[PDB]
Amino acid sequence: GSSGSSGDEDTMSSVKILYVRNLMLSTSEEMIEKEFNNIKPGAVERVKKIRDYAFVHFSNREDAVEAMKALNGKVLDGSPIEVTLAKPVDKDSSGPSSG
């Protein structure tokens, strides 16, 4: 078999988020979870519905990316829904340099 693991860190800051806009008030979370889940089973971390928007989290960026495009350009409940990578605000945490 193949080695398996090389042992290293490509991306220290791995963030996966999918923001949705133009969501029909009639549409429910289940619809958002199922639609996004259709891509991968047990992939959607959580689904937060909002007035006319919502956010979808994932376990790995890879999955989030797939579900992003796959849906990117879809019409749910008769409405053009969009999916992009949300950019959450944050600041480099301060800690002990030598630890």
- Of 24, 21, 71, 23, the residue nearest 43 (C-alpha): 71
* Spatial separation of the C-alpha atoms in residues 78 and 62, rounded to whole Å: 28
Q: Which CATH number fits domain 15-89: 3.40.50.261, 3.30.70.330, 3.40.50.150, 3.40.430.10?
A: 3.30.70.330
Cα separations in angstroms, 87 against 19, 72, 73, 76: 9, 17, 20, 24
List C-alpha distances in Å: 78 to 55, 69, 81. Answer: 20, 19, 9
- Tell me the helix, strand and coil percentages in the chain, rounded to 5: 20, 25, 55
